[PDB]
């Protein structure tokens, strides 16, 4: 139950502020605004760190192929269990994958027309 503004405060990496500004605006404009920090169990998720760590591996598809969700959950202190790994993957898909597509591959969700 932490306010999303806490994500600006979880660290002061030079690139964090711009990333968060871009991310929250991206989410508000697509109709899925984020108001609270997502969590896995009782752990608030530092979305910026999670995004950066997944990017290091090469994105969602690469983490899936290399089966690195348990390593990520362990290294981010989310948990060492298979369930913590699956919960972390779920939160990445729900909160960050659409953004990954936009930022890493210039993907621009085809205008909702069809």
UniProtKB/Swiss-Prot annotation:
Residues in ARID domain copies: 13-104
Localization annotation: Nucleus
Tissue: Widely expressed with high levels in heart, skeletal muscle and kidney.
Illness: Coffin-Siris syndrome 1: A form of Coffin-Siris syndrome, a congenital multiple malformation syndrome with broad phenotypic and genetic variability. Cardinal features are intellectual disability, coarse facial features, hypertrichosis, and hypoplastic or absent fifth digit nails or phalanges. Additional features include malformations of the cardiac, gastrointestinal, genitourinary, and/or central nervous systems. Sucking/feeding difficulties, poor growth, ophthalmologic abnormalities, hearing impairment, and spinal anomalies are common findings.
Physiological role: Involved in transcriptional activation and repression of select genes by chromatin remodeling (alteration of DNA-nucleosome topology). Component of SWI/SNF chromatin remodeling complexes that carry out key enzymatic activities, changing chromatin structure by altering DNA-histone contacts within a nucleosome in an ATP-dependent manner. Belongs to the neural progenitors-specific chromatin remodeling complex (npBAF complex) and the neuron-specific chromatin remodeling complex (nBAF complex).
Subunit structure: Component of SWI/SNF chromatin remodeling complexes, in some of which it can be mutually exclusive with ARID1B/BAF250B. The canonical complex contains a catalytic subunit (either SMARCA4/BRG1/BAF190A or SMARCA2/BRM/BAF190B) and at least SMARCE1, ACTL6A/BAF53, SMARCC1/BAF155, SMARCC2/BAF170, and SMARCB1/SNF5/BAF47. Other subunits specific to each of the complexes may also be present permitting several possible combinations developmentally and tissue specific.
The protein, known as: AT-rich interactive domain-containing protein 1B
Organism this protein belongs to: Homo sapiens (Human)
Higher taxonomy: Eukaryota, Metazoa, Chordata, Craniata, Vertebrata
Full-protein interval shown: 1124 to 1237 of 2319
